[PDB]
Chain A
Amino acid sequence: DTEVTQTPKHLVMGMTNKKSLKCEQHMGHRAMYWYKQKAKKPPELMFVYSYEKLSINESVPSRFSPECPNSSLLNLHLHALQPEDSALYLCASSPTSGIYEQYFGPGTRLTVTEDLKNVFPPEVAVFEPSEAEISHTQKATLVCLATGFYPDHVELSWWVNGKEVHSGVCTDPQPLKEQPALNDSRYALSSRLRVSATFWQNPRNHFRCQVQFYGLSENDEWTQDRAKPVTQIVSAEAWGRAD
Chain B
Amino acid sequence: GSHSMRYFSTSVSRPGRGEPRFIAVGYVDDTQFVRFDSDAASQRMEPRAPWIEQEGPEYWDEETGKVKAHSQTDRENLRIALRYYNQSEAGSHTLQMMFGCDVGSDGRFLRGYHQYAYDGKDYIALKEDLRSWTAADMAAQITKRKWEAAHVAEQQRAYLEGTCVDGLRRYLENGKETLQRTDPPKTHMTHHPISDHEATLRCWALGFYPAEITLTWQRDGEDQTQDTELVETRPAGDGTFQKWAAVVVPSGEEQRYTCHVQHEGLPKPLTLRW
Contact with A along B62-74 (1 / 0, CB 8 A): 0000000000110
Q: Is B90 an interface residue (CB 8 A)?
A: no
Q: Is A99 an interface residue (CB 8 A)?
A: yes
Closest-CB distance, A236 to chain B (whole angstroms): 55
Query: How far is A93 from B177 in the complex, measured between Cα atoms in Å?
Result: 48
Q: Is A183 an interface residue (CB 8 A)?
A: no
Q: Is B150 an interface residue (CB 8 A)?
A: yes
Query: How far is A98 from B72 in the complex, measured between Cα atoms in Å?
Result: 13
Is the Cβ of A97 less than 8 Å from the Cβ of B76? yes
Residues of A within 8 A of B76 (CB): 96-97
Query: How far is A224 from B215 in the complex, measured between Cα atoms in Å?
Result: 98
Is the Cβ of A97 less than 8 Å from the Cβ of B150? no
In the complex, residue of chain A having the shortest beta-carbon distance to the beta carbon of B73: A97
Residues of B within 8 A of A97 (CB): 73, 76
Q: Is the interface of B mostly helix, strand, loop or mixed?
A: helix
Query: How far is A29 from B76 in the complex, measured between Cα atoms in Å?
Result: 14
In the complex, residue of chain B having the shortest beta-carbon distance to the beta carbon of A50: B72
Query: How far is A98 from B73 in the complex, measured between Cα atoms in Å?
Result: 10
A74-132 residues at the B interface, CB under 8 angstroms: 96-99
Query: How far is A62 from B175 in the complex, measured between Cα atoms in Å?
Result: 46
Residues of B within 8 A of A98 (CB): 150
B51-105 residues at the A interface, CB under 8 angstroms: 72-73, 76
Query: How far is A97 from B143 in the complex, measured between Cα atoms in Å?
Result: 13
Residues of B within 8 A of A99 (CB): 150
Query: How far is A96 from B150 in the complex, measured between Cα atoms in Å?
Result: 15
Residues of A within 8 A of B73 (CB): 97
Contact with A along B22-43 (1 / 0, CB 8 A): 0000000000000000000000
Residues of A within 8 A of B72 (CB): 96
Residues of B within 8 A of A96 (CB): 72, 76
Query: How far is A96 from B72 in the complex, measured between Cα atoms in Å?
Result: 9
In the complex, residue of chain B having the shortest beta-carbon distance to the beta carbon of A98: B150
Query: How far is A67 from B72 in the complex, measured between Cα atoms in Å?
Result: 23
Query: How far is A208 from B96 in the complex, measured between Cα atoms in Å?
Result: 69
Closest-CB distance, B125 to chain A (whole angstroms): 21
Query: How far is A33 from B229 in the complex, measured between Cα atoms in Å?
Result: 62
Residues of A within 8 A of B150 (CB): 98-99
Closest-CB distance, B106 to chain A (whole angstroms): 36
In the complex, residue of chain A having the shortest beta-carbon distance to the beta carbon of B151: A99
Closest-CB distance, B164 to chain A (whole angstroms): 20
Closest-CB distance, B171 to chain A (whole angstroms): 28
Contact with A along B135-155 (1 / 0, CB 8 A): 000000000000000100000
Closest-CB distance, A128 to chain B (whole angstroms): 60
Query: How far is A97 from B150 in the complex, measured between Cα atoms in Å?
Result: 11
In the complex, residue of chain A having the shortest beta-carbon distance to the beta carbon of B146: A98
B102-160 residues at the A interface, CB under 8 angstroms: 150
Contact with B along A177-209 (1 / 0, CB 8 A): 000000000000000000000000000000000
Query: How far is A97 from B76 in the complex, measured between Cα atoms in Å?
Result: 9
Closest-CB distance, A165 to chain B (whole angstroms): 45
Query: How far is A99 from B151 in the complex, measured between Cα atoms in Å?
Result: 9
Query: How far is A96 from B73 in the complex, measured between Cα atoms in Å?
Result: 9
In the complex, residue of chain A having the shortest beta-carbon distance to the beta carbon of B69: A96
Closest-CB distance, A114 to chain B (whole angstroms): 40
**6 residue pairs bridging A and B, Cβ less than 8 Å apart:** A96-B72, A96-B76, A97-B73, A97-B76, A98-B150, A99-B150
Q: Which residues of A contact B (CB under 8 A)?
A: 96-99
6 closest Cβ contacts across the A-B interface? A99-B150, A97-B76, A98-B150, A97-B73, A96-B72, A96-B76
